[PDB]
Each structure stands twice: as C-alpha cells, then as structure tokens.
Amino acid sequence: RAKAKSRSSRAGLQFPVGRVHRLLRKGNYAERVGAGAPVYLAAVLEYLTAEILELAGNAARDNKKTRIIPRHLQLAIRNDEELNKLLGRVTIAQGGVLPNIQAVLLPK
C-alpha cells in the first residue's frame, strides 16, 4: 500500500505521538481518546524538554563543559523563573543547589 507516514512526522514532532497516544490508549486516563490529544501532549512535552535542555546546555557552557550533567539541570531549572515553578516540587538527582549565600551571613 501507500508508504506509511508516522504521526510525529505529519504533525512535525520529535516525541513519539504513537507511543504517547499509546500510553494513553491503554492508560485508562480516559475512556475513548480522540485524534488530537496525543499530538498536543507530545508537542508540549517535547517543548518543555527543549525549553529546559536550552538552559541546561547554556549553564553547562558557563561551566566550560560539553556534557550536560544533572548539575546543569538543577542550576537551570532553578535559574529560570517559570521552569522552577513548574518543577518546584521536583528534586533532580545529582544536580546540587545554587550558591545562594544569605547577605547577613557574610564578612562585615
């Protein structure tokens, strides 16, 4: 038959719409999924992934490292005002913290 086109490709996404919708079809998140839910969900998922990978890589470069470590994730998700909010109640393994030293605990 026709050369089969995927659902990540037709829409123009990298995250698997087939796999996303798939977790949804047998995920009981609902009872009869439509034909746009996985597309929107994957699009936004991967959008946030890109949003963060950006800040993580930029901080990494600030550290003169070419590989993103979990530190390049703690520093980032705490450096950006809205990523921190979204991931406020999330601990990133082996990420560390940001060097926020209280002003009153300094040399005087």
């Binding site: 470590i69 601990t91 560390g96 060097p99 926020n100 030293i101 040399p107």
Partner: protein, 95 residues
C-alpha cells in the same frame, strides 16, 4: 582562621559541587535498619538505596535552607533547634 572565614569558604564550595555529602556505607545500614521494622529479610536494589540518599540529602538541604531564614529572623547567625522546629511546623510536618 577567623571564626566564620573557613566556614564561608565551605558554604561556597559545597554549594558548587553535586556529590553526596553523607557517607554511603554508614547511610545504607540506616536504610536497612529502618526497613527492618516492616519486613524481615528485605533486599534493596543498589540504585534504590542511592535514590533514598538523593531524596534525603535534598530534603535536608532544603530544610537547612528554610532553617537559616528563621535564624536570620531572630538576628542570629547560628541556626538553633527551635529554628528547625519552626521551619518544620510551618512545614506541617509536626504541626
């Protein structure tokens, strides 16, 4: 060294590294002794104990970040046990 000069250096140094701060071997026995009271002969995946440590060090670092703000509340630099208690009560852990 002027009291507080070698301690501020350590604040700037341990806020820039990402390695764990509790020793492994001593902490893994605590995680097994605590498990003791729920099931005789429980096994742990190595990564499971590592995840427990990654949970607890983050929790304690957050609690010592919220406890410092209470110490600075009473015009103190020393964090006092009532500071941990005030932070935790405002946390709803022991309200």
């Amino acid at each position: 060294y002027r009291p507080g000069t070698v301690a501020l250096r350590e604040i700037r140094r341990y806020q820039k590294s990402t390695e764990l701060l509790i020793r492994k071997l001593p902490f893994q026995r605590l995680v097994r002794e605590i498990a003791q009271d729920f099931k005789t002969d429980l096994r742990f995946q190595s990564s499971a104990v590592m995840a427990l440590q990654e949970a607890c060090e983050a929790y304690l670092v957050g609690l010592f970040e919220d406890t410092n703000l209470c110490a600075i509340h009473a015009k103190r630099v020393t964090i006092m046990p009532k500071d941990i208690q005030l932070a935790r009560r405002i946390r709803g852990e022991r309200a």
